[PDB]
Amino acid sequence: PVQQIGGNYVHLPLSPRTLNAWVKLIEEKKFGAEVVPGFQALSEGCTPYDINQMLNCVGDHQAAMQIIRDIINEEAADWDLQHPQPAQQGQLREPSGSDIAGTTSSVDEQIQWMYRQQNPIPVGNIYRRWIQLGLQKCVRMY
């Protein structure tokens, strides 16, 4: 997530312990249900970068990544259209679907987007609850 240093916002990364307590939620509960909110709780206030950091920690128990990516693109699609860029220079770009998901953006951008004065956009808590929707998918598969 992010910490404010004198009116300025700086990425504070996820403490190791804060990933552990999460990797453990799977391997000890292995999806199911207790993870949908479990994740949501850890997910609180993160950037797209952070969310990603979490997932890579469990690309071994990976039989579920494929369907989550499915919804991300499904919604990224819904996004690259409804709110398009639609275009520049100097000013930071408008966040596409690949941006919001953290795959074509830096964390600086993601913060630059979450906390801009003129029209701030919560990429964290947007992409965040794509992950939420893609997870119920997983859940039912049980």
UniProtKB/TrEMBL annotation:
State the source organism's domain of life. Answer: Viruses
Q: Which InterPro entries match?
A: Retrov_capsid_N
Q: Where is this region: Disordered?
A: 82-103
Name the Gene Ontology biological process terms. Answer: viral process
Please give the name of this protein.
Gag protein
Task: Tell me the organism.
Answer: Simian immunodeficiency virus
Q: What is the lineage of its organism?
A: Viruses, Riboviria, Pararnavirae, Artverviricota, Revtraviricetes
